[PDB]
From a paper:
Here, we report the first structure of glycerol kinase from the thermophilic filamentous fungus Chaetomium thermophilum (CtGK). Glycerol kinase (EC 2.7.1.30) catalyzes the transfer of phosphate moiety from ATP to glycerol to form glycerol 3-phosphate (G3P). Overall, the CtGK polypeptide chain can be divided into two distinct domains classified by Pfam as FGGY_N (residues 65–325) and FGGY_C (residues 331–583) connected by a flexible region. A similar case is found in CtGK, which forms extended dimers via the interaction between the C-terminal domains with a prominent contribution from hydrophobic residues (Phe422, Gly436, Phe389, Leu394, Thr437, Phe439, Gly440, Ile441, Thr437, Thr445, Leu438, Ile450, Trp580).
We initially determined CtGK in an apo form using ethylene glycol as a cryoprotective agent. Initial molecular replacement efforts using a conventional approach were unsuccessful, we, therefore, decided to solve the structure using a MoRDa automated structure refined pipeline. The asymmetric unit (ASU) contained two polypeptide chains. The electron density map allowed for building the residue ranges 65 (or 67 for chain B) to 583. A short loop of 8 (or 9) amino acids (542–548/9) connecting the α-helix H18 and a β-strand S18 could not be modeled due to insufficient electron density. This likely reflects the high flexibility of this loop. The physiological dimer is not contained in the ASU but completed by a symmetry-related chain forming a rather elongated assembly (A:B’ and B:A’). The dimer interaction is mostly mediated by β-strands located on the C-terminal domains. Although crystals were grown from the same condition, the collected datasets were processed in different space groups. We observed that in the absence of nucleotide, CtGK adopts open conformation, which upon nucleotide binding closes up.
Numbering used by the authors:
A (entry chain A): 67 to 541, 550 to 583
B (entry chain B): 65 to 541, 549 to 583
Write the structure that this text describes.
Amino acid sequence: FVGSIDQGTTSSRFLIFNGEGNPVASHQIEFENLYPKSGWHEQDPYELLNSVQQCIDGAMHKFASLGYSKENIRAIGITNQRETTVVWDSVTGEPLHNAIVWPDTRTSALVRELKARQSADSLLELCGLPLSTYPSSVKLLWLIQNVDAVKQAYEEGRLAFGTVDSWLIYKLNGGAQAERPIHVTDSTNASRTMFMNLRTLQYDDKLLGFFGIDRNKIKLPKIVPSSDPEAFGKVATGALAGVPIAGCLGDQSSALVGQCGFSPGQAKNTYGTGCFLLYNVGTEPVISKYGLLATVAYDFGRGRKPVYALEGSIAVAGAGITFLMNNLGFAPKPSEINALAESVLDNGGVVFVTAFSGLFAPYWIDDAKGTLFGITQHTTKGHIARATLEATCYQTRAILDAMEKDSGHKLESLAVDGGLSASDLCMQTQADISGIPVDRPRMRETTALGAAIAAGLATGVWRELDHVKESIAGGAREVFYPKMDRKKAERLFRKWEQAVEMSRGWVRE
Amino acid sequence: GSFVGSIDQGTTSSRFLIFNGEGNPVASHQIEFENLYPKSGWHEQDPYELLNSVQQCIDGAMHKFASLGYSKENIRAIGITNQRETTVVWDSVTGEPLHNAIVWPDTRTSALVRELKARQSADSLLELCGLPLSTYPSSVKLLWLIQNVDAVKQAYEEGRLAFGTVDSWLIYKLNGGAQAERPIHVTDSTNASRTMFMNLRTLQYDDKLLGFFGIDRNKIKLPKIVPSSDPEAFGKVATGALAGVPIAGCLGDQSSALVGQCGFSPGQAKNTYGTGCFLLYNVGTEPVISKYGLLATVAYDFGRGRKPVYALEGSIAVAGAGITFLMNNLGFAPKPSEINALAESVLDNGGVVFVTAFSGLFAPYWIDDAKGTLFGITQHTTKGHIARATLEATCYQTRAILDAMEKDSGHKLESLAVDGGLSASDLCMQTQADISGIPVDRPRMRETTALGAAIAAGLATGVWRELDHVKESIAGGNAREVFYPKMDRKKAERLFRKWEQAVEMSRGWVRE
């Protein structure tokens, strides 16, 4: 009845859902990347554009294998990797260069000079973001500045910029060769560029004046809401041709919607090499005083007000496990690392400050390295494994507490997906440390369900939010509850904060 | 023939060895015996399990001695070296113990010590006896026994109580105990310098010291302090395989190790490795009270008209314990050989530093609130970095103690001899020479501690005439034996610099 496009960094895919949130079709084909110098990442635009409509042609032929068709489906939404900068010609509808994916770090030079300018300190309170290498403001500028090929398209009047969501929507309505050429972005992606006032949801002339981008010389994408039938046009050519595009959400905002994290204080944590945390702060935007990112969680328009969020990341969660295995020869497999941590009753007094490349929000300690405290002849691999897992939960709490202070709303729930969210012990400890229930849903493609939720509300599939989350019932092991005395959990977190402070100042030059 | 026998009564084992004139042993026997741990921190021994193990070693050893065609006629005399500070109480008329021995690492005196410190005349003890109040000295053990054992308190009151370090106990019995012509209740200056009952410059007892502990020299028979090399004060073995063989040497074990290395010049030091380290530093005829927490004791009292020699002492709690930790606790490798190999497998510590303060840090740092702390871990850290850091920790703590020794004494470090345990790791000691900037001497003759007692005995009986005759004879003798510095002083000083930073960043971890 509804469906979803989930294009990202490694791959595309196209799932199609029902009124209960159950995915009844999928098709996913990968694609590879370049590293043409340390810190450089690129991607020919058409590759993933073609990648995605390759997915829909197979995904939707399987779809009809049980007698369903487009006429049975109302609209489709889009969720996409963020911060990726694309550039093309007003005239052609064709790339005037290749793309700069978010991992790229060629802008470091540019960022360090931008950070010097006097009015660089006024940006954060307006776009909600720190000057960095990920934002699209600097990827685009670097090209206007450095690139030999298409500085003139800026100068001549024929250049158009877009995030991935816009490029897809562009050609999927018929490129420049269509009745109504659709060149737009949703709020959750434009919050990433550093061109948008977070309070206005509209391009700010002060932020463009900082980077020197003249709107008369460049064609930017019209910012629209994440749920709208008219504004995303329709699908140009394919099995879904003529079906309305009605959804668009950035990568990690869409996941929150799929988990139905619609209330202030609701957070989610995605584990991996590290963590990525997202915190729903409500209808009023919040600028972090702790180095966290402020973004748009979702903008369903339709009369309702936009909901914002705070963003936080941790460099080391799963890397801590790999370290104990490959670097220390504890075990040759991650499961056995949990077994070594369920080995022992407690951390034995051990604390592992996993600051391999320093520490980040909320601490911001650049002169620390990995530091292991509390070792005795009684310490064993179990204790160190247990502490390594605890390091992840302490840094999670530290950020969540920071978003509590930033936002003025206390934490109410946390949902978690990712390799180390599989550790029952790790997830139980988070509930003990955070004093709040830790949710772990079986459903996997949350990040694509959000784009479909948005398209559905635009089209009457779901009446409201309170309705979206009643429909999902259709689709220890799912929820972990605080079992430790609140006093013992404060004691653990205090030894950890103590260890962090005593880690400061290791690297002297 | 003419050989010299040596009883080495240790805290875990007893052994009896028989040395020729050039310090090489030809007969040996060793016995691990029972150590009792009745509760947390307490450590006891049956005083007869120590005598018995010694006697068994004498039987076993000279069985081997005879197989070579020798006998007692070929043994001029016998030397004794023992675990220090281990306390024994016995009835001065029956000769039978009144309580198990309390071995030196016992902790039961923590309350007695913490209170004695309060008594406010304690700051004077260090300059008289060379030691501060610890759980280790015999005084507080003897006191705990009295304050908590009616059996000894009675014998005390009745005037029939005798205390003695293990050396006194042994010589008392091997001469026949009571019930003998020429009974012997004597201790050597080295062992007597560990009780806190004796004045270090005097080499005699101090009434003010025993006034501090509530001990009167009439109600208790103290062993007679005698030279470590006396032809007649130690008497002779009465029965057994060595009946009639004179005893002429007696030295605390750590002093005997220094003598076995021929460390008689001021500035010569030695390090005995084990679970931890014991370092001794020769400082000449004048005793030197430490300002860095080191212990001042007697190095050796060889008589024959030569002034006693004193020493400074330090100890590290974690040297071999660190290797054991990496192998068993972290599964790195199952033998010290492979830990070394893993340490040589990489070029350097990779920026890793391991403050091996499992039970806090002792001299000269005196940090009680630190625990084992490992710095410098990145995703590029491998087991050889940590292995390297673990061996380096022992060397840094060694250099720390030796630099305190130089400052206290005024003598530049002239040499360092090494025996036991981690001594066998060429990279550990190569690194030690690198860090301290002096050559490191490792002899291949392993029973260095047993040798020092035989030296004392032989000097009292003419096996060696003077002390330059002794090191001449030893040299009458695979692995290397000398490690020379290889490192840029700058890099060596950077490594020690990072260590001292890590030590300082490690304090304050433990809170109560």
